[PDB]
Every structure is written in C-alpha cells, then in structure tokens.
Amino acid sequence: RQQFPVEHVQLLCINCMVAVGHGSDLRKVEGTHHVNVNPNFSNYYNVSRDPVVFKDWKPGGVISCRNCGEVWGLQMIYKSVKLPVLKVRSMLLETPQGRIQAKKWSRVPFSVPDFDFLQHCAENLSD
C-alpha cells in the first residue's frame, strides 16, 4: 500500500462526500480511538445526546454530518474536554491518488500522531 503525507489527504463524508476535514487534524487517543482536534470541525457535525451503555474518557453525544446526517462517530470527554471520535468506515479519504474508504484506521495511507493532551492546553482560555 502507498503512503502520503497527512497534509495531502482530505476527509470527506462517506455519504455526501463534502470536504469536511484534514487528515492532519487526526490524532490517536489511547492508541486506537481516532479523534479530530481541529476546533473548526464542529462546523460540519451535529451532536445528539443519545447516550448509551475508554477508561479515562466518558462518551458524549452521537456525531453526524450537518449536511446528510451520516453518523461519523461519538464524542469523548476527559477532564471536561470534548473531542469527536471518528469511525474509519464513515470517512472517505481523498488522497492525491483518489478516494479510498478504509475499514481499519491502522490501514490508512498515512501516519496518525498520538494525541497530546498537555499541549492541547494551547486552548485553555476556552473550555
């Protein structure tokens, strides 16, 4: 399989395929959970409190495309902070090669850095 710089892969909604994110905004939490840490991201998803029943994070609401209503994943919270956790199969990866839908995050044509909580406090004033 190929390999691109994350900067070169854009996120689209598997369904409506609107440009919704950047692969460069992806982070790994607890190794596995893939969040997006770009604040401007919330402009693309609605949240809905369908709580349901991950050791340092409590799940928030279910997350879905503002534009077609596709479910993308669910919120996750830790020490008062809320991040959108993305399901791989809900994303269309727009590589310079074209568009590929994956079924495991561990198989995306780029590398996703671990999430840095401390440094995420570049966002202290808010929340």
Which stretch, 36-44, 54-62, 69-77, 91-99, contacts Hg ion (CB under 5 A)?
Answer: 69-77
Name beta bridge partners: 91.
13
**DSSP three-state, residue 13:** strand
104 CB-near residues (< 8 Å, 6+ apart): 88
Q: Is 65 annotated as a binding-site member?
A: yes
For residue 65, state whether it binds Hg ion (rule: CB under 5 A): yes
For residue 70, state whether it binds Hg ion (rule: CB under 5 A): yes
For residue 71, state whether it binds Hg ion (rule: CB under 5 A): no
For residue 92, state whether it binds Hg ion (rule: CB under 5 A): no
Q: Tell how strand 91-95 and strand 98-100 pair up.
A: antiparallel
Three-point CA angle 88, 92, 94, nearest 5°:
125
Three-point CA angle 118, 84, 67, nearest 5°:
145
For residue 11, state whether it binds Hg ion (rule: CB under 5 A): no
Q: Is 121 annotated as a binding-site member?
A: no
**Count of residues that interact with Hg ion, criterion CB under 5 A:** 7
Binding mask 13-42 for Hg ion (x = CB under 5 A): x-xx--------------------------
Tokens of 41: 């991201």
Q: Which is nearer to Hg ion, 75 or 115 (CB)?
A: 75
Residue written as tokens 């090669």? 97
Residues at the binding site for Zn(2+) are 13, 16, 65, 68
List of residues contacting Hg ion (CB under 5 A) = 13, 15-16, 65, 67-68, 70
